[PDB]
Symmetry: C4
Subunit: 329 residues, 4 copies
């Protein structure tokens, strides 16, 4: 909110495009928003709101909101403190923060910041490098492995090709000194850790069930922000069916286009356990570093609280039982 404006007139055009971009025609980028805007909540009235709380328990810990910071690589591209700033603010808001495999600061350093860090894994050509990285994460106190499963390789970003965009020399992959994940990769991760494994990028109902059968503690119903298959269904379009198929067997998160506490409320009403928020957290980082993320998070927290109360929900659990109605435009 208001932040995107402030980040546009400050980032190089090509960095902003790397941030804002989808794959191909960006059909799935836009559909993430369209899809949300079509969802109407049916609020409830006249319930006791004496103790409205936005807290949830997830993967063992309490979170202040039903939200985590989404994994986004190379946070130094947006601000010089990069991941550390986002991490500090997330910790101080009581929101999980997801450390990327391609973080521009090492994962041990990010985790040292404390709070409730998660680690996002990309499967690499070498199975041992992947599993090491999982072990580092866990040795460092990470609370979940978010296995990104919708990147057998990177989709085609048309902005980045026509930009000629490339990592400037002062941003690197601090965890280092590119292969398709299968269900066998998932099992290897699962066998190597006692942390919950959360599969990110699930859109098919049967992949959701199979995730549960494979021992995942969670999924993220996501089309990777419209960055992977162009024409992939939005996550929010599949969430409700996926929630009903998994039948409480794992946590179900959603992301893509979450831009307000109203949108969090919509996601929750469709049955999400929590949302991830990606580009907005980068807009706030770029606009004003740590303090800027802290304010995004405060604003989101007040919007969630407000939306929940107006919908007659004293708890996220109540918000999950709200009904919705699909509407026009």
């Amino acid at each position: 909110a208001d932040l995107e404006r402030a980040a546009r007139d400050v980032l190089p055009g090509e960095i902003f495009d790397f941030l804002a971009g989808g794959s191909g025609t960006e059909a799935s980028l836009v559909a993430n928003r369209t899809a949300l805007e079509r969802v109407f909540v049916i609020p409830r009235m006249l319930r006791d709101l004496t103790d409205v709380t936005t807290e949830i328990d997830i993967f063992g810990r309490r979170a202040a909101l039903p939200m985590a910071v989404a994994p986004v690589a190379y946070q130094r591209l947006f601000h010089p403190e990069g991941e550390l700033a986002v991490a500090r603010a997330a910790r101080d808001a009581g929101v999980p923060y997801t450390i990327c495999t391609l973080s521009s600061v090492s994962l041990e350093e990010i985790a040292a910041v404390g709070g409730r860090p998660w680690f996002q894994l990309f499967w690499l050509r070498d199975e041992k490098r992947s599993l090491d990285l999982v072990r580092r994460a866990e040795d460092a106190g990470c609370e979940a492995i978010v296995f990104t499963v919708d990147v057998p390789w990177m989709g085609r970003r048309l902005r980045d090709m026509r930009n000629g965009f490339a990592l400037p020399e002062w941003v690197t992959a601090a965890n280092f000194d590119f292969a398709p994940a299968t269900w066998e990769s998932v099992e290897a991760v699962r066998a190597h850790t006692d942390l919950p494994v959360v599969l990110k990028g699930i859109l098919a109902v049967e992949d959701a069930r199979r995730a549960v059968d494979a021992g995942a503690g969670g999924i993220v119903v996501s089309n990777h922000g419209g960055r992977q298959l162009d024409g992939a269904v939005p996550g929010i379009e599949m969430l409700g069916e996926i929630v009903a198929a998994v039948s409480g067997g794992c946590e179900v998160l959603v992301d893509g286009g979450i831009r307000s506490g109203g949108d969090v409320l919509k996601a929750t009403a469709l049955g999400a356990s929590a949302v991830l928020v990606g580009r907005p957290v980068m807009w706030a980082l770029a606009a004003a570093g740590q303090d800027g993320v802290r304010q995004l998070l405060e604003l989101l927290a007040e919007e969630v609280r407000d939306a929940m109360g107006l919908a007659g929900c004293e708890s996220v659990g109540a918000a999950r039982r709200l009904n919705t109605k699909l509407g026009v435009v």
Copy 2:
């Protein structure tokens, strides 16, 4: 009609925004209109129109049209005679007028004007202050208590924050010299009055049924003009289901976006007993005081009469039995 133009070039920008505004992205403001525009009426032909009447009986009294003036606070913000002017015109049109808790003239004075006044209650931190206010209303001859139940607190108006909008010093809360209502608040009102209690802001079908079981004489199916939860379903989208669930157990009114006699006809065909009209009555007040409201009301009366006759309805009851068809744009 034509009036909004005339009110824009006369009100301060910030007052007009206080009037026109919704919550958040104004998703629900716009959806109130969108929703109405999608409804098509299926007219009937060749019936006897020898005695077309727009009258209805509601809460004991006869009303000239299936319409009442909606509660809108601080009517002095729009014209110096404020509530008194609107009240006089409503009385002379034979339309109920709803006195607000935050009226800029006292409720006893508004009621003295005569006609068929209703009183809109906000629940206040002190249960005794609320109930006093109910007793004043009734002692003053008000015919219904319209308990507004969709304001456990005020939604977030983005226009008003970015305006910095505030009550100028020459407009005040004349009934005085802010708490969430529950079903227990409703029962306390219901126990304290023999007037019909009308719950305003019901959108869930189960809240409608429960309203009836709680002894409400009416509900208003409403998303508070898009001013409360941003993303709340429009009232008009829920009306038909709500009418069928309550099964004649209480009157069912609707509001939000009613801009013509055709729209009243649409509302009635979806099963509403009557509509409320809010912003238009303020546009006409601001454009030309009492006389201006009188003309809005005459124009609406002729539009309802015209719409009804063209649809083959000699009575509002007939108009409620019309069928509708949802259409594109």
Copy 3:
């Protein structure tokens, strides 16, 4: 086609608005088009087209196309020869022409032109004046009475009020030297004539059935070009249901927005026996008098023929058995 342009830059603005206009917000004017554009035809292939014919039998006579000229009053408003010109061209195209009650040339004169004239009746305050007018029509060789039943009175034209539009002194109601029709009016017409009675302005399925039970030979499924109830469903939206309810019991025509032979084909595929065409015939009259109508009619005839052949229909009957599919925009 192309003609509307040519009529705009030739008619007074107010005459063109009288022609182009709908009621209220013109919601139903526009919806007539929208509705047609959403209908897709499912063409058939590889059938024998050796003898493609656009002819139909209706109300006793053969017509060259499944089309008639719609009743439109005061044709002298558009061209000095007015009804006579349209009538001649219709006759020479083999298309029925509907003489209006408010024709700017007498009905006997219009009928003398020959061809297959129909007469459109408005019910007047005096039952005897209406029935006389029916008798004149029949004495004059008219082949059908098109009882317009959707004008208990004229809808509210906003263009005409804000224009101040009025009949110039050189155009009059040549049949003369305003009351609601009921089913009893229909029976009186039906008893007074051996001609088929065709009810025009039927939108409800039950009014269609009742028309058949009342002995109508036809109906016209029509919202009077969006000129009567603003918010009335389009005819084309109701046609298919109406066709199935009447079950061959009377002819079912449709009008509203028919602008091409493709649209005629769409109407026929939805089950219409024929269409009426209104504003386009006036555009062609105003653009170039009789010759101009003759060319509209030739162009329409070639479009129907073309559309039919491409859809694999050798006859209108075949075109009625085509399937359709509703689509987006």
Copy 4:
């Protein structure tokens, strides 16, 4: 992609319009795109992509992609090498190329280029001329006869009439030195050749079944690029039903608006065996002759491969089992 721009600023306006154009209002041209954009793919995750192949077997031969070049007449209109250039590139990409009846180079010469050529037949006034042409095709090594069945005659192109467009003198019908096909024409073709007969322009489910019963080896579900009946349903809207009715009885291809490998993936997910691509291949021919077509084909090949992998399909067969979801805009 990017090519259309490059072809616009190089072709005469009237040639480009002959290329880009639909029939009538171009309702069906646009609906081909609209229809595709509404289809969302539901990708699968975590499958083995170790050997992703885009190959299919069709009509006896292996093709490199599930795609063929669509028949487009008078390719010399777009580039001086015309059909020979497109043919060479198609052959080198391993894509079938469809030789037109109205090719601007003879079919024997086009076929000599080698690769996997198909021949598109128009039925001519003389049954013997048609069958000769079939025999030439087969004598020349063509692998399929694509009988175009949606041109009993050419639809009405409004661009071409208002252009006055005509074949310049340096482009001719090199196969020569105009009649409606029936099922009897199909049987005569079928009896005269041992090649698979592929009916192109099937939109009705019953025509699809009957095609199979008539011994067709394939159909192309197509509205001829919006060039034949204006208002014809898009192919992509009918594909899924047609696939299920034919029940593997013949190959089912689709065309109309295929503009990317994502669109090929959408088509395949709806059950197509392969797509045809028309106007894009001409844009690339006009932009840069053979090399330009070679690059279109390489880009398409990488897009298909990318789309497939991101959707978790190692083979076209897998892509056919993907589910889809219809979405808004």
